Design a protein around this ligand. Structure first.
Ligand SMILES: CCCCCCCCCCCCCCCCCC(=O)OC[C@H](COP(=O)([O-])OCC(O)COP(=O)([O-])OC[C@@H](COC(=O)CCCCCCCCCCCCCCCCC)OC(=O)CCCCCCCCCCCCCCCCC)OC(=O)CCCCCCCCCCCCCCCCC
Ligand SMILES: CCCCCCCCCCCCCCCCCC(=O)OC[C@H](COP(=O)([O-])OCC(O)COP(=O)([O-])OC[C@@H](COC(=O)CCCCCCCCCCCCCCCCC)OC(=O)CCCCCCCCCCCCCCCCC)OC(=O)CCCCCCCCCCCCCCCCC
Ligand SMILES: CCCCCCCCCCCCCCCCCC(=O)OC[C@H](COP(=O)([O-])OCC[N+](C)(C)C)OC(=O)CCCCCCCCCCCCCCCCC
Ligand SMILES: CCCCCCCCCCCCCCCCCC(=O)OC[C@H](COP(=O)([O-])OCC[N+](C)(C)C)OC(=O)CCCCCCCCCCCCCCCCC
Ligand SMILES: CCCCCCCCCCCCCCCCCC(=O)OC[C@H](COP(=O)([O-])OCC[N+](C)(C)C)OC(=O)CCCCCCCCCCCCCCCCC
Ligand code: SF4
Lengths: 51, 162, 49, 142, 71, 92, 132, 103, 64, 120, 58, 59, 67, 284, 58, 153
């Protein structure tokens, strides 16, 4: 009984780590959307910079 | 004369310190050794009076002879006494050490440890109870505290020593 | 001796020349010589101490 | 808090504990939310990584799930004669579940107030970023 | 008097002086630090002022006096 | 009778030693802080604790004061003949 | 040009927000195909332009002096951590954009907002500051 | 790497043998061949390695790389250009490499 | 788990230098004034890397 | 690392040692030392020592020092990837894991050959 | 616990990364004027050395 | 000031060491050397590998 | 076992967005690394190098600036 | 005239400043010595509890000056150098040991950027100082010409090999998180939770590291009173022996500081005790 | 009083000369060989700094 | 000096002075590493002496004969003719005020730089460019351990 409960307990912890990694991804998207609010312009490289 | 103004107070500070940390040598012969080890444990705490045991004579302040001394051990006891750092004091514990004791009429026993090394104090029993050993150690501590200034110098007309 | 006197003179002139060129003929904007430069608070980037 | 404000360092050099300022900020943002409550384009423009109903369900279920786990744990791991350690175990499990649910709503709150940052006006944006009620004066004063 | 009252009194007598000492490493010298901080502030003569000023220097003085900004 | 519990009374013997240890440790820490806090009117952060841009801004004025003014005001007879001049910023 | 570095950054926030054209010209001049920089002598003139527009950027309205001094004290106490003092700096720039509207701003302060502010970044450490 | 492998090979040589010499029991006979092999291989490897590292350092200093093509191109172009006219350094580099390989 | 028996013991052979004692043994007095020697034990101890090889217990220092 | 203040602090440490030296010299006024036969001789549990200079250890654990020399190099080579692990890629990760695997394999070989103990 | 703690450390690191993006933006705002002053001073020193070298070598 | 709190923790680690001195017996050098070189190094390296794997998972 | 697990999860991570794919398979190097390892690189032809913003013009988000 | 005598005072006017710097350091040294003394007394008292006795109770009032008495007596004791030993080395190794042990206090951190020096490689400095002290101990054991002391020196060599490997592995594992050698960088990561949460599986190994670096009961080799009379101070008494235990207790104190900084939150309160009731963010 | 490049080249070759000079005791030669490797270490670092090359630190 | 202990001590002091030069020339990090490594080695060396030369007694050698026969004139000739320093000047060759490149700062990669330690070049070389030599040194250490075990056997 103890060993099967331990087996069941190790699993779910991996599930919770998966969930918290996904929440980290969500927070990263949230902050990206916040920070790109007033930074929507791009200046092209001038033609005098050759290839 | 003026030097005493500094020396006389400082003397006390020198005595107090050496009275507050009186480290005997870890050395026990026969069964006064067992009684001494009883005198060291929590029932009678020498550590209360700042008495802790050091294993080497170079860090010891008191030599505690606590057992029978044979003719085979006398040179070793003499060497151990000589190899202790000054100043040092010697305590003789029990009958076998104070005199011959229960083996005074034997062919291989030194008739008292004071035939080999000087002795500062004697504890008479066989064995002297931990009560008596603590009494003797406290007496020796008080004596060595008072021993730095026993009034050897004379006072001049200014109440100053020499 | 005379040569010892000459050496002492040259050493003293070297010491005084170094000190004189550190104290004067040199901008004083950083604290290098204590008790001879000002120890005030500067509000601008370039203030003479 | 564990991380503080997402837009600034909370107590970096000086600690400010001004309940009036935070009450003003909350009132101004509630007024803004209520004013733009019935415009369908603004309602449809709101985006958040997790819905509100799922957040409510998670907060309602996580402490109950933890309490059930603790009850099972004491029932088939602890002697029923005693009473103190079992109560402590249920308290710990329920607190862990409540922590998970509070984490759900806190992440929802963060996403709500940081994904719709461009919808707020300039004064509201400044008040939110700097945590100062003096920027959007007109929102909370009247 | 309960025993824990006396124990708490002793603990407070130990803890308050230590906490106070840890709070102020520069004992009896924080006033000099406050004076230095006050002198570090720039007056109106230490900066270049904008000529087209909405509020004059005196007007800012009365504003600060009235607002109790305490700067 | 309102005596202390027996387990508490035994451990209370070591408390004055803890108090004197705390006094000495607080003194040591306070002296370290005060010695650090005197020359810099604040507790200066470590130079390596800042970003690359911050490192340039914190040392720009010192560079200008110590290596720019003596170089832009240099004259041939300004230097000492004893050859004990200021050392370069980078040692080669 | 004779001002200190932290003051330069504090002014530079508002200056970059106002001196956009000269900054754009300077940045376009200094562009290169390598992370290695260009010769500064090739972009001196535009650089001068930038400095010129910075000069009038430094001149400030009297009502912004309190915010400027608070930002300066924060900068000095933090040893040039701009993010840790980005709040007060913002309060400065919002003044420089509109000196007239700032007065009502200063009238909205609470009791604690009207107190002299002392920064001690050792006793108060913020929340997970990487540069501390 | 290969020199360490060769040292490992030299180490695991058989030392004692089963022979028909029954006169050497209860007497000490010293061979000393194993020690000489290990000693000389060890010190020759040391000398060669230090001199090769020295040459590598100066080749980076002179050219900026130890690639064969870059080194050859740089040396030939310098011969054509007459830019680096330190014959002593080139002679010493060549000498050190050659002597390291000789050892 | 392989055999390490040869690393464990070292015999002696007549006139064999590699089988003899190739070291000066540490001859120590486990003498009476030692904490582990009790009171009067004077044990002549031969140590080789803190391994006890030869014992010579001198007793009679408390023979009365 | 440090700065020029370290040498000055070492000199200050030497001055503090001078303070202790002065205290110890002053303490000599309160005792006398009498010359005796065995007082200045080696102490060996109360009897006379039979050796002075030739006190040689067996050093039957040199393989431990041999392996320590190599694994110190192992770990000092391991530091940079740990310091800059935030910028890892396929190559860095593969190299780090291969290096750690080689260390483990070497330790396993040592354990198999039983060179991690005391020998006669 | 080891897995959860590693995840937490990664969380604080990502939060610091976001703050670092913001600080980098502020530093970008500050950069051009610092660059202009640096270039002007560098060119002043270079012009001094150029005129000195020309006078010496002419 | 922070160091106050620090002192507390230091004191704790002083008390634990004294209690360990009063409680535990003493090893032999060879025994602990064998334990370290045959058991603990592998545990340290495995812990390092686990930490690296977890960081790669989460980063 | 941890290695097999982490590589399996890294390969399964491909279902996420580009910034959240596994760094084991996607590179996130600093600007010096990126420039030197992608300079004159035709396999990953990233175009011209932006100097003020140290990124290649074909990299997403290169040269982001305030409006 | 003053204008022509100011140069002469350029250098000597800086002479007092150096002096006062020395004074400051002296004070610090004294203070740290004092706290170490207190720890000594603390030890005895704590031991008394485990043994159910009183401990020092009669030196001063209720045993308040035991460490002072011990230090003064150790000063008073008169040292003798045996013949057959090198007198120069016999007196020089203790001096070097004291000078080394009175340096550990520069590798200390009390709050962010509060150390006396701006050192960055704190762990490297700790390793250097530890190996220097081990050098001193081994040389003391060798030059004492005593068999027991020299066996203890060999034991110290074995101990330092073991601690080199063991602490190197611990430092390798710890660097992976902080990415720095400085002490102040671990606290910013430990503000939320302590690193023992990650290192829970190797808590026994961490405690072993603490004991091994401190030379506590399971690893009290080179000072054992049973196998040896005394570890390395068999022929040493007076203030050389005092210097050696001063160094040992300095090692105790500063490694306890190091462990507390790098694994137990440093100078942060145990916030994890309320980990279930803390919000990650506050916005409004 | 001597340039670092010439100083360190001469130091390396002098170390080799002294290694050859001293009486042939194996431990002495081992110690001198270690010193030779350390001199190479220092020279490589010096040239790596002078020429801005990252391979010499390696 | 022919005493092994004094040779070891003087080599230890030489290592200290090498680290001091690295510190002066502003390669601080490489002073921190070198020392500790060699320090450990020196420690082990001392133990080796305790096994192989317990007393400082050494071979009774006379250094004068070889000095006056071979080493002095060879050293004189080598010093006379050996110099592989093409161009490099002391810091006092020209006035310091004529140098200006240490003052220049480029702030655009200052805010584009995310590095916070000094291990970046070592990381680049060991795990990007010279990774082949890194693998070679690892294999070399493994083979050396195997060879050491076989030598012990
Ligand atoms: C005025 C300042 C002194 C006040 C005072 O009580 O002095 C006597 C105070 C009591 O010590 P004691 O007479 O040796 O009593 C020892 C007994 O074994 C045990 O005596 P106890 O059971 O009464 O324990 C007393 C202990 C109990 O204190 C605590 O339990 C507080 C926490 C201690 C650290 C953990 O409190 C103190 O020692 C006083 C601490 C506050 C004054 C110093 C502040 C700095 O003496 C000292 O503190 C000497 C130093
Ligand atoms: C008057 C001295 C001679 C003179 O002309 O000095 C001019 C010179 C010019 O300074 P100023 O412009 O007048 O203002 C400097 C102030 O420190 C104002 O600057 P501040 O407030 O930023 O400085 C904080 C304040 C912080 O300093 C304090 O608060 C000192 C008093 C509390 C010390 C607490 C820690 C020790 C606890 C031990 C427990 C056992 O002072 C310092 O940090 C100065 C250096 C202090 C070094 C530590 C001295 C510890 C002595 C311990 C003696 C007992 C144990 C042996 O004055 C000083 O250097 C002040 C010396 C103060 C000594 C106090 C000794 C008590
Ligand atoms: C503070 C340090 C003070 C140091 C004083 C000199 C040291 C000293 O007393 O040495 C005692 C020794 C011995 O002095 P003494 O032999 O005259 O005194 C020994 C003590 N009585 C008086 C009991 C015999 O003196 C010296 O070495 C003289 C030093 C120069 C004066
Ligand atoms: C030599 C045995 C093996 C050594 C292995 C490596 C040891 C590394 C260092 C460990 C510590 C012990 C060394 C320091 C003390 C002895 C000094 C010494 O060796 O002198 C020999 C040298 C030479 O020894 P000598 O003078 O006996 O030799 C005469 C010449 N022959 C060899 C021909 C016989 O001593 C001197 O030159 C005179 C004494 C000078 C002592 C100066 C320092 C004294 C101690 C001050 C405190 C320590 C330094 C500061 C603190 C540490 C840094 C923060
Ligand atoms: C023996 C006595 C030797 C005295 C000379 C030592 C070398 C020069 C001084 C040290 C040095 O270079 O410091 C600056 C360097 C750092 O360079 P820096 O950048 O601080 O130099 C000052 C700045 N300029 C060049 C502009 C003047 O210090 C270090 O690298 C740290 C040295 C730590 C030493 C630790 C103790 C060693 C043993 C004693
Ligand atoms: S005097 Fe008596 S009791 Fe004491 S040790 Fe002698 S025999 Fe034993």
């Amino acid at each position: 009984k103890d060993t099967i409960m331990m087996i069941l307990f190790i699993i779910g912890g991996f599930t919770y780590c998966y969930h918290m990694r996904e929440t980290r991804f969500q927070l990263d998207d949230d902050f990206n959307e916040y920070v790109n609010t007033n930074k929507q312009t791009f200046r092209p490289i001038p033609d005098h910079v050759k290839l | 004369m003026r030097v005493d103004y500094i020396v006389t107070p400082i003397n006390a500070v020198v005595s107090w310190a050496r009275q507050g940390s009186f480290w005997p040598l870890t050395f026990g012969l026969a069964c006064c050794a067992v009684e001494m080890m009883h005198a060291t444990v929590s029932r009678y705490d020498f550590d209360r009076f700042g008495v802790i045991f050091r294993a080497t004579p170079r860090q010891a302040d008191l030599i505690l002879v606590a057992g029978t001394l044979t003719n085979k051990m006398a040179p070793g006891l003499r060497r151990l006494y000589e190899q202790t750092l000054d100043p040092k004091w010697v305590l003789s514990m029990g009958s076998c050490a104070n005199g011959g004791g229960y083996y005074h009429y034997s062919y291989s026993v030194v008739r008292g440890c004071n035939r080999i090394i000087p002795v500062d104090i004697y504890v008479p029993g066989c064995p002297p109870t931990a009560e008596a050993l603590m009494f003797g150690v406290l007496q020796l501590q008080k004596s060595l505290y008072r021993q730095i200034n026993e009034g050897e110098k004379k006072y001049n007309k200014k109440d100053l020593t020499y | 001796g005379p040569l010892n006197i000459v050496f002492a003179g040259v050493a003293f002139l070297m010491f005084y020349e170094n000190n004189y060129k550190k104290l004067y003929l040199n901008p004083r904007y950083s604290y290098t010589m204590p008790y001879l430069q000002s120890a005030k608070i500067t509000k601008n980037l370039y203030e003479k101490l | 808090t564990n991380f503080g404000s997402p837009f600034r360092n909370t107590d970096s050099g000086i600690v400010i504990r001004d309940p009036e300022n935070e009450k003003r900020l909350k009132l101004a943002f509630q007024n803004f939310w209520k004013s733009k409550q019935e415009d369908k384009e603004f309602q449809a423009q709101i985006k958040t990584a997790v819905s509100k109903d799922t957040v409510n369900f998670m907060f309602y279920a996580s402490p109950l799930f933890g309490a059930l786990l603790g009850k099972t744990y004491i029932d088939m791991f602890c002697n029923p004669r005693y009473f103190y350690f079992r109560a402590f175990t249920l308290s710990m499990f329920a607190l862990a579940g409540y922590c998970v649910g509070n984490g759900f709503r806190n992440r929802y709150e963060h996403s709500l107030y940081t994904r719709n940052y461009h919808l707020f006006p300039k004064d509201l944006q400044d008040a939110l970023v700097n945590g100062d009620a003096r920027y959007c004066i007109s929102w909370w004063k009247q | 008097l309960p025993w824990f009252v006396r124990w708490g009194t002793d603990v407070a007598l130990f803890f308050i002086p230590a906490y106070t000492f840890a709070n102020y490493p520069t004992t009896f010298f924080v006033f000099a630090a406050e004076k230095r901080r006050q002198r570090r502030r720039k007056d109106f003569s230490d900066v270049k002022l904008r000529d087209d000023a909405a509020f004059s220097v005196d007007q800012v003085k009365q504003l600060q006096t009235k607002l109790h900004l305490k700067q | 009778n309102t005596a202390y519990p027996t387990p508490l009374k035994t451990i209370l013997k070591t408390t004055p030693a803890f108090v004197v240890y705390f006094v000495f440790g607080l003194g040591f820490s306070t002296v370290i802080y005060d010695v650090v806090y005197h020359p810099k009117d604040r507790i200066e952060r470590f130079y390596f604790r800042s970003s690359k841009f911050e490192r340039l801004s914190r040392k720009r004025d010192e560079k200008l004061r110590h290596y720019f003014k003596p170089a832009i005001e240099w004259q041939p007879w300004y230097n000492t003949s004893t050859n004990n001049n200021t050392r370069p910023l980078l040692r080669y | 040009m004779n001002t200190k570095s932290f003051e330069v950054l504090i002014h530079s926030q508002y200056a970059f927000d106002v001196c956009r054209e000269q900054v754009y010209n300077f940045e376009d001049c200094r562009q290169t195909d390598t992370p290695l920089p260009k010769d500064p002598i090739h972009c001196k003139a535009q650089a001068k332009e930038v400095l010129s527009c910075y000069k009038e950027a430094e001149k400030m309205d009297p009502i912004c002096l309190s915010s400027f001094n608070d930002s300066r004290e924060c900068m000095f106490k933090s040893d040039g951590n701009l993010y840790n003092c980005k709040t007060w700096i913002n309060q400065y720039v919002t003044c420089q954009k509109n000196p007239a509207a700032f007065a009502e701003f200063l009238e909205a302060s609470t009791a604690e907002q009207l107190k002299s502010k002392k920064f001690d970044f050792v006793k108060n450490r913020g929340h997970s500051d990487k540069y501390l | 790497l290969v020199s360490c492998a060769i040292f490992y090979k030299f180490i695991v040589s058989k030392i004692s043998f089963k022979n028909s010499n029954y006169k050497d029991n209860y007497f000490s006979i010293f061979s000393k061949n194993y020690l000489n092999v290990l000693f000389y291989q060890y010190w020759s490897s040391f000398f060669s390695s230090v001199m090769i590292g020295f040459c590598i350092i100066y080749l980076f200093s002179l050219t900026g790389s130890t690639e064969w093509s870059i080194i050859n191109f740089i040396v030939a172009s310098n011969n054509q250009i007459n830019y680096y006219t330190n014959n002593i350094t080139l002679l010493f580099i060549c000498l050190t490499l050659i002597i390291g390989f000789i050892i | 788990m392989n055999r390490s028996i040869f690393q464990l013991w070292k015999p002696e052979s007549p006139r064999s230098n590699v089988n003899s004692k190739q070291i000066k043994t540490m001859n120590v007095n486990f003498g009476p004034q030692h904490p582990a020697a009790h009171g009067v034990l004077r044990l002549i101890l031969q140590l080789n890397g803190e391994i006890a090889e030869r014992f010579d217990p001198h007793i009679g220092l408390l023979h009365r | 690392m440090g700065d020029a203040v370290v040498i000055h602090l070492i000199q200050n440490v030497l001055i503090f040692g001078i303070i202790f030296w002065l205290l110890t010299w002053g303490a000599e006024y309160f005792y006398t030392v009498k010359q005796q036969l065995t007082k200045k001789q080696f102490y060996e549990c109360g009897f006379k020592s039979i050796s002075e200079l030739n006190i040689q250890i067996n050093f039957n654990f040199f393989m431990l020092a041999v392996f320590l020399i190599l694994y110190d190099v192992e770990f000092t080579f391991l530091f940079p990837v740990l310091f800059n692990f935030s910028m890892f890629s396929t190559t860095e990760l593969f190299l780090a894991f291969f290096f750690i695997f080689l260390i483990l394999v070497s330790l396993l070989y040592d354990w198999l050959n039983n060179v991690l103990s005391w020998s006669a | 616990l080891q897995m959860w703690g590693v995840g937490k450390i990664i969380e604080i690191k990502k939060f610091m990364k976001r703050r670092d993006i913001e600080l980098k933006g502020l530093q970008r705002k500050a950069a051009p004027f610092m660059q202009s002053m640096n270039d002007v001073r560098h060119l002043a020193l270079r012009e001094r050395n150029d005129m000195l070298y020309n006078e010496l070598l002419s | 000031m922070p160091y106050f709190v620090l002192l507390f923790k230091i004191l704790i680690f002083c008390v634990v060491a004294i209690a360990t001195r009063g409680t535990l017996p003493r090893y032999r050098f060879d025994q602990f050397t064998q334990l370290n070189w045959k058991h603990f190094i592998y545990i340290w390296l495995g812990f390092l590998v686990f930490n690296l794997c977890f960081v790669t998972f989460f980063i | 076992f941890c290695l097999l697990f982490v590589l399996a999860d890294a390969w399964g991570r491909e279902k996420y967005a580009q910034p959240y794919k596994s760094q084991i398979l996607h590179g996130r190097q600093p600007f010096g690394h990126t420039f030197v390892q992608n300079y004159r690189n035709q396999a990953t032809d990233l175009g011209r190098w932006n100097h003020n913003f140290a990124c290649y013009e074909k990299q997403p988000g290169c040269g982001r600036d305030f409006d | 005239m003053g204008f022509w005598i100011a140069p002469l005072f350029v250098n000597i006017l800086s002479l007092p400043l150096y002096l006062v710097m020395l004074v400051y350091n002296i004070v610090c040294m004294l203070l740290i010595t004092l706290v170490i003394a207190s720890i000594t007394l603390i030890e005895r008292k704590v031991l008394s509890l485990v043994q159910r006795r009183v401990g020092p109770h009669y030196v001063g009032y209720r045993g308040r000056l035991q460490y002072i008495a011990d230090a003064l007596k150790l000063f008073i004791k008169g040292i003798v150098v045996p013949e057959g030993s090198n007198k120069f080395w016999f007196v020089a190794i203790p001096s070097a040991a004291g000078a080394i042990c009175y340096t550990f206090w520069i590798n200390s951190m009390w709050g962010p950027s509060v150390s006396i020096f701006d050192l960055e490689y704190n762990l490297v400095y700790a390793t250097i100082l530890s190996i220097l002290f081990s050098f001193c101990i081994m040389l003391t054991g060798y030059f004492s010409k005593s068999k027991y002391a020299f066996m203890a020196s060999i034991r110290c060599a074995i101990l330092m090999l073991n601690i080199e490997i063991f602490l190197g592995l611990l430092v390798i594992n710890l660097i992976f998180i902080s990415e720095s050698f400085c002490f102040s960088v671990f606290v910013i990561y430990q503000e939320i939770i302590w690193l023992i949460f990650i290192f829970f599986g190797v808590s026994g190994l961490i405690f072993i590291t603490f004991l091994l670096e401190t030379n506590r009961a399971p690893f009290d080799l080179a000072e054992a009173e049973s196998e040896l009379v005394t570890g390395y101070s068999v022929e040493y008494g007076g203030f050389y022996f005092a210097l050696y235990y001063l160094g040992e207790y300095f090692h105790l104190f500063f490694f306890s500081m190091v462990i507390s900084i790098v694994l137990f939150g440093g100078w942060e309160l145990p916030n994890f005790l309320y980990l279930f009731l803390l919000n990650d963010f506050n916005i409004l | 009083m001597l340039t670092w490049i010439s100083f360190w080249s001469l130091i390396f070759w002098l170390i080799l000369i002294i290694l050859v000079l001293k009486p042939k005791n194996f431990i002495s030669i081992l110690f001198m060989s270690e010193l030779t490797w350390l001199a190479l270490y220092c020279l490589s670092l010096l040239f790596g700094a002078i020429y801005c090359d990252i391979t010499l630190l390696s | 000096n022919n005493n092994l202990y004094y040779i070891l001590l003087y080599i230890f002091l030489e290592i200290v002075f090498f680290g001091l030069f690295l510190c002066l020339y502003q390669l601080e990090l490489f002073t921190g590493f070198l020392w500790v490594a060699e320090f450990a080695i020196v420690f082990i060396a001392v133990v080796l002496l305790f096994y192989l030369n317990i007393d400082g007694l050494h071979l009774k050698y006379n250094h004068n004969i070889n000095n006056v026969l071979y080493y002095t004139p060879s050293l004189v000739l080598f010093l006379i003719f050996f110099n592989i320093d093409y161009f490099s000047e002391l810091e006092l060759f020209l006035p310091l005020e004529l140098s200006f490149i240490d003052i220049y700062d480029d702030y655009y990669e200052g805010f584009n730089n995310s590095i916070m330690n000094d291990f970046t070049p070592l990381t680049l070389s060991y795990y990007s460019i010279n990774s082949a030599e890194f693998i070679i040194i690892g294999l070399l250490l493994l083979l050396g351990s195997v060879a050491c075990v076989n030598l012990y056997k």
